[PDB]
Design a protein around this ligand. Structure first.
Ligand SMILES: Nc1ncnc2c1ncn2[C@@H]1O[C@H](CSCC[C@H](N)C(=O)O)[C@@H](O)[C@H]1O
Ligand SMILES: N[C@@H](Cc1c[nH]c[nH+]1)C(=O)O
Length: 321
């Protein structure tokens, strides 16, 4: 009853991954793709982040899920739960319980770039819900959504405001593509962190424990290990900023001094100037009405909207137009 499909394993997929890292490192303003945070070490660092006092999103969303999962399941009526950027799927157990309770649960399809997190969560869920079929998919949710099985009536969930780690142009492409993988009867549950006080927003990405910093820097450890690079992690400092124009948090890594870095697997040497900054992640924060309009543009209609009392975070349920 357990399966794993691995689409990131192909050299065709590897080439695209490496091409995107190369483009980031060779652009006039440097960047790295957010997906490279998530090797085994990074997946655990994010798990640490979810427990920080500063990082309100996980517990806020979990509280909405704890109190609204029945409602969500009743509206979706799905027998199949698809989770994008699933990670450890800890919040997802609330959804799985509610589907099981409703006597609908037949299948769980976790989808992640990290196959380790898939094998762990997959084996766990497989045991916690005997008789369920598990179809783990290792892929890039910007490239491999078409590989998610079309079986049954599906609730696709994208929690944790991961959607905000895409800038508006690829975000629109992603949502349009996602919409086009949905069949009649399918649903999207989307978590979106909302615009709020920016002290709160910036602190959630710049905790006093240094955890987010370590998580940010680890992207250099991943590149170092996997692409034969020689970034000096000590040479770069974590920077979190509020971009008010784009209404998004931005994580940067800034060079303390001039750095000269080879990435051997890419046949690539790059340099940083003193004080030069590299963009490692964006975290877009949303206004409620813009979420409605973004879904609509993609060909999706918001049918349900749930928020916490303080309006820190929203969950949307959407169907095809
Ligand atoms: N491009 C991509 N394709 C597939 N998975 C991705 C991805 N970019 C990041 N991820 C995965 O998506 C998750 C984002 S962190 C979110 C974890 C969990 N869903 C939660 O809400 O807490 C991580 O597990 C990461 O490994
Ligand atoms: N998806 C998470 C990833 C993250 C947490 N902290 C830093 N990055 C977010 O945008 O909030």
């Amino acid at each position: 009853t357990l399966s794993l499909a691995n689409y990131l394993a192909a050299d065709s997929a590897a080439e695209a991954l490496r091409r995107d890292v190369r483009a980031g490192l060779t652009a006039a303003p440097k960047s790295l793709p957010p997906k490279w945070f998530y090797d085994a070490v990074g997946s655990d660092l994010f798990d640490q982040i979810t427990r920080l006092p500063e990082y309100y999103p996980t517990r806020t969303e979990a509280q909405i899920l704890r109190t609204r999962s029945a409602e969500i399941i009743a509206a979706a009526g799905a027998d199949t739960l698809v989770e994008l950027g699933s990670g450890t799927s800890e919040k997802t157990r609330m959804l799985l319980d509610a589907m099981r309770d409703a006597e609908l649960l037949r299948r769980f399809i976790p989808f992640d770039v990290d196959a380790g997190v898939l094998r762990s969560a997959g084996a766990a869920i497989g045991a916690e819900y005997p008789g369920i079929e598990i179809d783990a998919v290792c892929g890039d949710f910007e490239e491999h959504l078409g590989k998610i099985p079309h079986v049954g009536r599906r609730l696709v969930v994208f929690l944790g405001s991961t959607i905000g780690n895409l800038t508006p142009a690829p975000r629109a492409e992603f949502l349009s593509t996602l919409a086009d993988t949905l069949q009649p009867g399918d649903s999207l549950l989307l978590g979106t962190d909302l615009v709020k006080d920016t002290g709160r927003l910036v602190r959630a990405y710049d905790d006093a424990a240094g955890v987010t910093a370590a998580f940010n820097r680890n992207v250099l450890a991943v590149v170092n290990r996997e692409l034969s690079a020689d970034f000096d992690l000590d040479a770069f400092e974590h920077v979190a900023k509020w971009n008010s124009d784009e209404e998004r948090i931005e994580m940067w890594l800034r060079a303390r001094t001039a750095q000269h870095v080879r990435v051997a697997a890419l046949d690539l040497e790059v340099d940083f100037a003193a004080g030069e900054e590299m963009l490692t992640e964006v975290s877009c924060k949303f206004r409620p009405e813009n979420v409605v309009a973004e879904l609509a543009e993609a060909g999706l209609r918001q049918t349900h909207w749930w928020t916490d009392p303080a309006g820190d975070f929203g969950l949307s349920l959407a169907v095809r137009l």
